[PDB]
Amino acid sequence: NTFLDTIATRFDGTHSNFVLGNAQANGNPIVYCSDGFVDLTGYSRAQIMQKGCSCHFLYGPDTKEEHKQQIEKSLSNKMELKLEVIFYKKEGAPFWCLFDIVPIKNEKRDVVLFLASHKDITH
């Protein structure tokens, strides 16, 4: 199977919140998102499928600038990131998110995807 299919399938049945971004396309576009991520954020899959893995569409007033920078650098340098950051749902409700990005490499050791997952840690 392809990397996109293979990675998504790994999480079947876990009800995880995650997206897959295409690292070989400008802007690192989201090319897949789980049902859990749809429910978490309040955005439809259709809306999410026109957004970037940086998850800029989740930024709001209290989203720290330094956190936005960390995310940009992670994606730009194609490196891992584990970050506690305030994100905003579709209707504006804020939530604390543990944002986890890992670069996915192919058989040639080239980064072809980003796996980015989201844990609601507002608790």
Author numbering: 12 to 134
Give sentences from the paper.
In the dELK PAS domain crystals, the asymmetric unit contains two very similar copies (rmsd 0.4 Å for main chain atoms of all residues). Analysis of the two dELK structures in the asymmetric unit reveals the absence of a large cavity. The lack of a preformed cavity in the dELK domain, at the same site as in hERG, appears to result from the presence of several large side-chains in that region. A large part of the volume is occupied by the side-chain of F110 in dELK, which substitutes the smaller valine residue present in hERG (V110). In dELK a histidine (H129) replaces the cavity lining phenylalanine present in hERG (F129). The absence of a cavity in dELK leaves the histidine side-chain buried in the domain hydrophobic core surrounded, within 5 Å, by the side-chains of several apolar residues (V30, F48, L51, L69,F98, F110 and A127) and two cysteines (C66 and C108). In contrast, in dELK the hydrophobic patch is not involved in crystal lattice packing. Instead part of the domain N-terminus forms an amphipathic α-helix (residues 14 to 21) which packs its apolar face against the hydrophobic patch on the surface of the β-sheet. Interestingly, a superposition of the dELK structure with the Δ9-hERG PAS domain through residues in their β-sheet reveals that the N-terminal helices occupy the same relative positions at the center of the hydrophobic patch of each domain.
The KCNH family of voltage gated potassium channels includes the EAG (ether-a-go-go) channels, the ERG (eag related gene) channels and the ELK (eag like K+) channels; these channels have roles in cardiac repolarization, neuronal excitability, cell differentiation and tumor growth. A defining characteristic of KCNH channels is their large N- and C-terminal cytoplasmic regions. The N-terminus typically includes a Per-Arnt-Sim (PAS) domain, while the C-terminal region includes a domain that strongly resembles cyclic nucleotide binding domains, but which has been shown to have little affinity for cyclic nucleotides. As already stated, the role of PAS domains in KCNH channels is unknown; it is not known if these domains bind small ligands or mediate interactions between the channel and other proteins.
